[PDB]
Design a protein around this nucleic acid. Sequence first.
DNA 1: TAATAATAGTTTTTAGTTTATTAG
DNA 2: AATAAACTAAAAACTATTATTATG
Lengths: 473, 107, 511, 289
Amino acid sequence: YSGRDSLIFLVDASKAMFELTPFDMSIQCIQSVYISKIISSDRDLLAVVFYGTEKDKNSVNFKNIYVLQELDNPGAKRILELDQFKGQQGQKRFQDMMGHGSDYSLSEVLWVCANLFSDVQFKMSHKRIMLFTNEDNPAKASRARTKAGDLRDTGIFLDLMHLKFDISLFYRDIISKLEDLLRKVRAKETRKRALSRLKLKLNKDIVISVGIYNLVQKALKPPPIKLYRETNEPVKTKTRTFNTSTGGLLLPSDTKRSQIYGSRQIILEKEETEELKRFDDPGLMLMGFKPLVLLKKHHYLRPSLFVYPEESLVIGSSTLFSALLIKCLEKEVAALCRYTPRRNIPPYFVALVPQEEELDDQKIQVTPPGFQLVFLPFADDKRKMPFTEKIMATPEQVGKMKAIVEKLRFTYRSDSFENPVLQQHFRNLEALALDLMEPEQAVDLTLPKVEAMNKRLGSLVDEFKELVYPPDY
Amino acid sequence: KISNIFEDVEFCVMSGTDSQPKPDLENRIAEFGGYIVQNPGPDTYCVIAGSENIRVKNIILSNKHDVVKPAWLLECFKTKSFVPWQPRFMIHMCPSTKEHFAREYDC
Amino acid sequence: NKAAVVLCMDTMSNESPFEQAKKVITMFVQRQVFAENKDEIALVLFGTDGTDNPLSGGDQYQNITVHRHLMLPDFDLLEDIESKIQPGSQQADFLDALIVSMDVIQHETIGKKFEKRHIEIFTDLSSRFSKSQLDIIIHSLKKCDISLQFFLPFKGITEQQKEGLEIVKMVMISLEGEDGLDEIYSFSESLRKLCVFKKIERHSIHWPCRLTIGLSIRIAAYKSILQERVKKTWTVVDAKTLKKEDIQKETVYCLNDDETEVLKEDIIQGFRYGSDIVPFSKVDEEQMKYKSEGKCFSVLGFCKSSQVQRRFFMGNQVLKVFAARDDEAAAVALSSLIHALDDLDMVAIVRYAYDKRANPQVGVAFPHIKHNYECLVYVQLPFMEDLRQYMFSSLKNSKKYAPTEAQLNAVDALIDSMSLAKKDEKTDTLEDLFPTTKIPNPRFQRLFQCLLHRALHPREPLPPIQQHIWNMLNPPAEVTTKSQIPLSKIKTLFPLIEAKKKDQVTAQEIF
Amino acid sequence: IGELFSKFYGELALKKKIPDTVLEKVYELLGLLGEVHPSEMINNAENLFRAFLGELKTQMTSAVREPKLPVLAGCLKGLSSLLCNFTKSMEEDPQTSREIFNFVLKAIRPQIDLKRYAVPSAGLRLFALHASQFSTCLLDNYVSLFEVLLKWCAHTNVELKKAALSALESFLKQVSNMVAEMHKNKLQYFMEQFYGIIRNVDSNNKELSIAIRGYGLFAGPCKVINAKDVDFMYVELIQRCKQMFLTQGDDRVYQMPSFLQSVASVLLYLDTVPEVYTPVLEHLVVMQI
DNA sequence: TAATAATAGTTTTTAGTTTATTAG
DNA sequence: AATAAACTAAAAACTATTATTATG
């Protein structure tokens, strides 16, 4: 989906930033937001265009407006522009070259904002404007309120907090908690493109699209491009199956794919090579229903994803899936599907465990109404060790470890942990922009936390040792 | 160029800000033929570093060459001639640079 | 690292036991050669005219001919067993072939390191049999320690087949017992289930981790029972040699300016820092990376078992922590703790890390109790970036698409009928009407069939599609008929439209 | 031209750079005829065409992952047509391969060429250029292609009409020259097809004209059997000229240069007929120019 | 005897092919 | 004294266009 929220930094200079002075904290807010945006989305554009200025620095050059980093993909440019002014000395030098609080017409700055939002040429789902003031800064406002309402009609959102929820009295009508904006949000990729929906062969006469969009799945380090070691510019990396016995690059008419099986390399053709990958057709070929009791769940270990419908290709996606998930309550089975994302794919036996919508009070689409992919394993990959079940539970031991650990009851917030590599290197990119150290470390909480406080909660496994040797080493 | 002694001697000004900005140091090193290279080139005799930043700490952690304070490059420029390695500017340096310190100075 | 399996093949052409036995042995060799499984098998034929055994006890072994000694299954053995063995003309005693094969296994095992000894025996039992050499047959069976795994032609046995079955059963109960009778199966049908796929595993050895809560863990690295993967990547070969002579890749690193190239050092893996590509390499990563927590299998937190999500599963193994090595206190503590955590539903978050070279992880800790193995399951859990979430039209609140209710009872009865796995019985019978967890996929087996096609005959490019899954991957006609009226309601009440991804003929072939 | 041809021939020898929307036609452009034809592209033509036929047999074959390849087909045909100028006409199996490949290119009409999607007509043109280039099997797949050309020339797109007519008549010339014994039965069957398409009415003013034009082309193939057999229908042609060409309305007055030259070809055997074809000559000149 | 129509095309995140030592 | 693999290896995304058959 093309379309995002375009945000501009329209910050007032009415010395409502200069009373810590609100300027420094506002600049920290905007820099943290830009740090989030550079590591999250370049599709969203950031405009460092402040008003209330002693200068008329803007496109139409209206009263008390300054442009620093207009609407653009986030980057270190705005980071350094705000970094040179974030400090109190930065604030005073800022007030020197930019200006102090001055008079102007709010219609002027709102017109400039309208020009900025109408000059970008991106299909943009939403538009937002942020603004900071210590208190309500205020004809001068009636035209301003009219223009702000019109911009709101154009999909532009207005954001303002008074840094005195106490004193914005003259701005209550004008207006349409920044600790979250202090980089609480950070490093979340925004892509909305993914594979075409697969065709569920639920039966032999009607097939229904299923929405499998890998758009908000795992995100990691940016693309490492083989830049030149001297000037930091990429290389083309001319690579292919090339020849030394005959020289040059082998042509497709001269390349044959084989399989070294038994005692020989079974030479086949490329056509057979890549057409062998298919057993049938693309889509979710449904065999039937498999009771959830027959899941190994010690082999449901690979990267698993969700199975959602898609009411875009067939009318009956939403209809039949709504009925199916309505009747999933009385079923202990899963939609036994074979999975081919495209043509020439080996279908995988998939059990569709019903994961219906968790519509909360606000109906947040947590676990959206559909199914979750249950792994039906095979016989080639698991690190199996020989089983040993001569050991059962003993009441003393079970009670002792229960009292040791039962206090620590978590809730398993699925996104609670932070990926080490991803956030690590993203904030490291932040530091590279800042030209500084390794900023901070990300980890999948892999350092245990209970072991330092299990005895604080009354651990008994440490207290009760089954052997003079560490009972479980 | 102006002083070809810096020619054929690549001074990797990859992050130099102790004395002059890295663009300015690169401009002056190319003014004398030192190659403007952002990561120590094949001819890099020493990495002309600067303030202790991500690049300077890259050179420290990965000792490809020295962390040369651009004051060493200043003494090279004022003489209009490459001044040998001195144990008074380069904070971090290659082992060959400490060897040069011992070669023409004491410890 | 070898298994000393052995075969003993063969008035004889009459279903026919001979054709079924040939089918199952060709299956056996083809399955051991597709995965290149290493289980040497010997073969001695009873009935194949000629008393030409390598070890004949006075040449009384009438019509007994050896085919292959204890040798590894290759395509050569596959085609030899496929082609050479033909039914004999005059009758012979299969116990003589048993003696010859067991003597071959004795000769090979005494001299070569064999970690397993078996006897995959499939005798058509239609040949006249004499039961007078009990001492030497039991001697041969017990000296090489080959597990006599005899199979029955059908119990669908004639008088000759009945007496062959009784003599082999008495010699095996003097050797092993009734386990042979348990594995005695009809050549077709009962043995046909084995006659369609392969049993396979990947050689490896222990690569331990450390469950470092406050502790460690004893594990091993293998690849035994988990979702199917690529066996061998397509070995591209030269059209001139069918080997690797011009099959290799170059690197030019053409500096994108413009035809100027770069060397291996001349590339720095610049990372796209959003608006700009930062000049970045692994030397920069040294101060821009995270160090792993060693090879720790630790646990970071304990959660209620109700919160877990099947869709939120990641990793590529589960550490089935059984009784620990040389630590009985560890074994009892582990069993009691997994059972107590199951009681509490207090599943632990396994703070895992593969090693320093890999990255640290989270996990899950819930015990999987089965008939054989009952211990913990470790599956990695999501993070702020692993939020697998789909934004589409919601289902139940959709009054715009709120279908009828005869469809609801239709769906209920359909579920009752399409339940294509038998519910577990009191005997821990994890029965599946369409077994998926253990039986392989249909396209890797398609490759197996295609490679059989192209190896038995290199001018046979592509055989029919592997119906291995297809025959057994369909619901029974009974349950489909039961849902038919529910299916009738579903089709008569649900509206929908067509779909896409229509792969037609690529060109205008002669049609 | 040699250096750039070598550069792009090396360029096409790589993998994964093809993906684009229309940039694949670079290969169609790589075929060159305005060159002086040094040994560079003379030698590279073999490798290029071998790759073309191999990848046509691979992709174009009924396949699961690949249901079509428009850029592929277009670029391959462009390069082949522009570079098969080098005479590879009767040598070996390449004739068979390329002939059957053009056959399976233009056998069926999936794309709507009547609505300006005339890629099949481009294939027809390429084959007409290189029909003689690949003759070990054009005598095998000879009819069905010919009637398919008849439908193509009967299509709404006038470009399809002209391309199909040109390709069909070029193929008729090919088979007339190298069929002629051997093609005695084939010649008789072609005469029967003619009979059906000429002695019966037809709504196309050019259909029967190209039928008799093929008569003139097959005046040789019948001549090795019996040119007097078609000289027997030459009297019927005299009946046509004396009756409908002087009734002026008549679109064969507009379309009998085909008839005139075919009559010349079939009448090479005969010598005498009294001043019959000169009122027609002036008539058709007037309504032809 | 002269406009509107579909290959026209994309910022393709998993084909599931590289890091990982007791076999002698 | 040879078993161990998470160091990436590829494909749809709505962009949008032409191309219709606009005329005797």
